[PDB]
Design a binder for this molecule. Structure first.
Ligand SMILES: NCCCCCC(=O)O
Length: 85
């Protein structure tokens, strides 16, 4: 069965487990506020699937999923999620 290996379009419905940015940084967890404080709180929009530190696209960015990063000097970065054929 399908296991979230790719995203449809820009990934508003992506629910896979990639947790590293394009440059290879580990993502910050959505339920954490350090190193970056933010307002993408999982409980505020459960259907946005903001789980663990997985790359997601909760602001409908046309470039696709991203995460806050664990680098204290890089707030966020896109991830490399392949688009489904
Ligand atoms: N469009 C991807 C980055 C969105 C970052 C929003 C923020 O700084 O809280």
């Amino acid at each position: 069965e399908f296991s979230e290996e790719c995203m449809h379009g820009s990934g508003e419905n992506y629910d896979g487990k990639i947790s590293k940015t394009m440059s290879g940084l580990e993502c910050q967890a959505w339920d954490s506020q350090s190193p970056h404080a933010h307002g993408y709180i999982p409980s505020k929009f459960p259907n946005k699937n903001l789980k663990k530190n997985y790359c997601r696209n909760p602001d409908n960015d046309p470039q696709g999923p991203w995460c806050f990063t664990t680098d204290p000097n890089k707030r966020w970065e896109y991830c490399d999620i392949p688009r489904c054929a």
